[PDB]
Each structure stands twice: as C-alpha cells, then as structure tokens.
Design a protein around this ligand. Structure first.
Ligand SMILES: Nc1ncnc2c1ncn2[C@@H]1O[C@H](COP(=O)(O)O)[C@@H](O)[C@H]1O
Ligand SMILES: CC(C)[C@@H](N)C(=O)O
Length: 497
C-alpha cells in the first residue's frame, strides 16, 4: 500500500515519512512564519538531541508546559523521537494539580516553563527549543510505546491515561471512514495541549501532510479575532466544543464574515443539540463547511463516534453522536445481566485498538473500568441505539440521586430541558429551600436572541416528565461556569444559586 498511515505503526515513523516525502510543504505556520516539514523534522531532531543530553530515554515521561505554538509542537515531536511520552501540564492548572500530575506520572524532565514551585528541576526552556530552530539535524518508538499521558478529572485524584502510538494510529486510520482530508487542508491548532482534542488537531494535520495553523496569542480572546485568523490564513478544518461554536456563529453572522472557506467544523466534548446548530445552518447551510458531531473519551483515544449534521438532525430535539469508528466494538449495558434491548438506554461499553492500556498506577480503578467479558472500557456514559444503528447520547451514568422518596435520573431531566428550542445548555442540581426542604433546581442558558421564563420552562417540562422530576426553580445564566478541564462545572453551578 502507498498509504503512509496504513504503512506505519508509530507516530514518529509516520511523521518522518510524511516529511521526507515532500519536505518543502508547510507543516506549521505562526502568522506569516511558515515552517516546512523538512525544517520541522530537523528542528525536532535537534531538540531531541538536547533531551537526550538531559537523560531522556525510551519509556520516559516528559512534562510539557507550553501554550499551543510552534515550539510546543517541536517539543512534542522531540519527546516522541526520544521514544518518550509527553505529559502536558495545562497552563491554567492550580499549582496543586500540576504538582500531582508531575509526581503521579514520574516525569523525569520538563520542556517549556515550570509552574511556580515545580518539583521537576531538569528543564529544557522554551528558549532552548527556539535556539535549535535552524540547525542541520536510537530505534525510535514502537507501536506499543506510550505517546502521551493525559489526565482526566473523574472527583478524586486526577487519573493518568497513557495512550500508545498504536492507539493514535488506530484513530488516524479510522478518520477517513468519515472525513475527506488531504495535504491541502489547513488545520487550526487551538486547544490546550492538555486536552486530547489537541492530539487530533496535531495528528489530523501531520498524518495527512497538511498545514497546522497556530492561533496567535493576540487572537486568543474573542470569536471575532478567531474568525479573522481562520479566514485570513485559509483554515479549512476547525475543531470546537459546541459552546465555542455558539460564540463563533454569533460573531460570524453579526460580523458578516465569509465562513465558506471552511471544509469541516468538528465538534467534541459536550452534548450537541439542534438549538446550537440552527442559527449557523440558517445563515450558512450545512455543506460548506460540513458540520460533524464527534463523541469521544481520553481513554479511547480522542474520538469514538461521529455524526455528520443533516437537515434531519436539525429537525429533532435530542443529541445524536452517530456511528462508531471501524476499530470499535460496542455494547449498551444495563445494571443487571448487561445488554439492553435495542432502543433502551444503558451504559456504553467500548472495545478495540483505540482503548488505552488502563490508568497509570491505578490497578483497582483499571480493573473496574476495563473489564474482560474481549476487553472493554466502561464509558460512564448513557446512550441508546437508534433503529439504524447510530447512537443517541443521553447523559452521564452517575447522575441518579435519591430525593424525597424517589430515585431521580438527573440526566433525564437535563435531556428534557435541552429539548426546548430556546435552550442551549442546562444543569439540574439539588439545593436547600427551607431547612430540611431540598428540591431539584435547574440552571440553564438561553439561545442567543431569546428569553424564556421559569414559567415557560415549567410548562415545557410538564408535558415531558412526571411531577417528581420537575425542577422547582429555574435560573438563567449568561453561560454555565466551567472548569479548565471543563466543560460545565457542575459544582460551581450550585454556588451560583
Ligand atoms: N459529542 C459528545 N456528546 C456528549 N458528551 C460528550 C461528547 N464528547 C465528549 N463527551 C463527554 O466527555 C467525556 C469525556 O471527556 P474527557 O473526560 O475529557 O475524556 C465523555 O465521557 C462524555 O461524557
Ligand atoms: C475532546 C473530545 C473529543 C473528547 N476526547 C473529550 O475528552 O472530551
């Protein structure tokens, strides 16, 4: 086969082949600064040498604390080239979380800038990375070697998820069952390196020989700045949370921007419903760009299912995550003796080459979350199979509570609220009214350009749910509060009340 993705079994071999084949093509751009594949390959070989001198060796975990930029990408390639795995430290981590991640992962070196009080002293500064830029530049990693460790909160200790070269290659090989990508695409590098969305951004581009466009620091604050850059730089593929997409849509429409240069907008990370999509579709249609809902988890290498948005999607009030990539086996499992009857809601279980080995030094947890039956991962997500095989996403599986004589599925209440045409987000929690009087309450976000009263929402819910599942109060918020890992911050919401 001529296909580099099918032919290579690790990311370093893949990158090296893509680069060597057409080394003058642009791999990475930052403003007007264009870095060719050949240049990037040599640059990262040089930085790898610097890491070798710091004792970095195959199997090592090397911390990475940098904002998404050219140097950070060079650093990633260098770490991988040393046969090591990178451990991204979110710049906006509380100091305690960073301390734990470094300790837990046994990071033996850090590249970039150490957070204040950082315990790792073996440091390759960003400046040293830049120094290597235009210089001349070991077996390299194998398929079963770790490429990165990304930590996912849930509360408890953050769980380290080691993902192998083979895991990522499985994802990259699955992508073309859904997407038409080529070396002429330009991908925006946007997400924090500590979020696995960035793994998809980086390797989506590199695996296809495309250009990775860095969002400049000046453009990092507003959707207007974001749009200016993606349009100016001829970006064809962007990746967004549904939340970010709301802001993008509003800026595009109000600013009269031309978005038709985009080929794909790819969603991940949150429940996607039609009210979040209808305004973009109204202005821009669904062809240029194509919109694709992606569902995935750190533990199964970024993405698991995709659903390309269609007119049909816009005409229904639920959330559809679509069909699983070819590597996956799936089960929808009840409590019980497991498998549910088609159409019924249960926990999604996943199998296949995209599954991580398990958590880092968490034998207890791994055994539970990665059971054998064929090895599976229990997503902790509730879904239901549609008549045609696509999955609808219901909610998280740990949201049942006990209240006033009932077991209550908070996820079902949230889903019912999300069915309202003028709601784009919602969180249901329990709070105290009178002492000894606890009740369901719902914080929600109105569709831009709409205003829905508590009374109207109560009336909406009356048609869908029994009275014991009715929120007692509603609270409109500009947006829901979010963690840096977030995603909605379910705990901060309770505080907003
Ligand atoms: N398209 C999506 N729709 C609904 N939920 C999602 C989607 N993508 C990711 N998630 C949620 O995000 C979780 C994974 O987030 P992470 O903890 O960062 O790995 C999943 O288990 C889901 O709960
Ligand atoms: C970023 C999305 C695709 C998923 N991997 C997540 O962790 O939220």
């Amino acid at each position: 086969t001529s296909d580099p993705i099918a032919r290579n079994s690790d990311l370093v071999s893949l990158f090296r082949e893509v680069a060597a084949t057409a080394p003058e093509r642009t791999a990475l751009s930052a403003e007007d600064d264009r870095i060719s594949y050949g240049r990037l390959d040599a640059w990262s070989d040089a930085v790898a040498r610097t890491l070798l001198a710091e004792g970095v060796r195959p199997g090592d975990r090397v911390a990475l604390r940098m904002s998404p930029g050219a140097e950070a990408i060079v650093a990633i390639l260098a770490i991988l080239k040393c046969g090591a795995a990178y451990v991204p430290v979110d710049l906006r981590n509380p100091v305690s979380r960073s301390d734990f991640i470094l300790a837990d992962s046994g990071a033996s070196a850090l590249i970039g800038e150490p957070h204040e009080g950082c315990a790792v002293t073996r440091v390759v500064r960003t400046a040293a990375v830049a120094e290597c830029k235009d210089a001349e530049p070991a077996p390299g990693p194998g398929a079963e070697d770790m490429a990165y460790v990304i930590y996912t909160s849930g509360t408890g200790n953050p769980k380290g998820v080691p993902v192998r070269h083979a895991n990522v290659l499985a994802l990259l090989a699955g992508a073309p069952s859904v997407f038409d990508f080529s070396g002429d695409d330009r991908w925006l590098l946007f997400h924090s390196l500590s979020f696995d969305f960035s793994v998809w951004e980086i390797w989506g581009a590199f695996s296809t020989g495309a250009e990775l466009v860095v969002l400049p620091h000046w453009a990092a604050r507003t959707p207007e700045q974001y749009l200016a850059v993606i349009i100016d730089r001829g970006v064809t593929v962007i990746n967004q949370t549904p939340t970010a997409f709301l802001a993008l849509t509003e800026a595009a429409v109000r600013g009269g921007r031309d978005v038709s240069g985009l080929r794909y907008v790819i969603f991940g990370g949150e429940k996607l419903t039609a009210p979040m999509l209808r305004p973009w579709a109204k202005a821009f249609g669904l062809d240029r760009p194509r919109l694709v809902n992606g569902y995935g988890i750190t533990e199964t290498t970024v993405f698991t299912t995709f659903e390309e948005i269609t007119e049909a999607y816009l005409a229904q009030d639920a959330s559809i995550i679509g069909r699983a990539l070819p590597s996956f086996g799936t089960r929808v499992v009840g409590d019980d003796g497991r498998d549910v009857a088609p159409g019924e809601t249960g926990e999604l279980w996943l199998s296949g080459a995209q599954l991580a080995e398990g958590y880092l030094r968490r034998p207890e947890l791994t055994a539970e979350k990665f059971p054998e039956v064929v090895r599976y991962y229990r997503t902790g997500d509730l879904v239901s199979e549609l008549p045609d095989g696509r999955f609808a996403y219901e909610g998280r599986a740990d949201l049942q509570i006990k209240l006033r004589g009932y077991r209550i599925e908070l996820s079902d209440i949230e889903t019912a609220v999300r069915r309202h045409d003028d709601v784009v987000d919602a969180v249901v929690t329990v709070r105290e009214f009178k002492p000894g009087d606890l009740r369901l309450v719902c914080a929600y976000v109105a569709r831009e350009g709409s205003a829905t009263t508590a009374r109207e929402l109560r009336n909406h819910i009356k048609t869908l749910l029994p009275a014991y599942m009715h929120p007692a109060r509603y609270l409109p918020l500009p947006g829901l509060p979010r963690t840096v890992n977030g995603k909605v911050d379910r705990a901060a919401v309770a505080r907003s009340w």
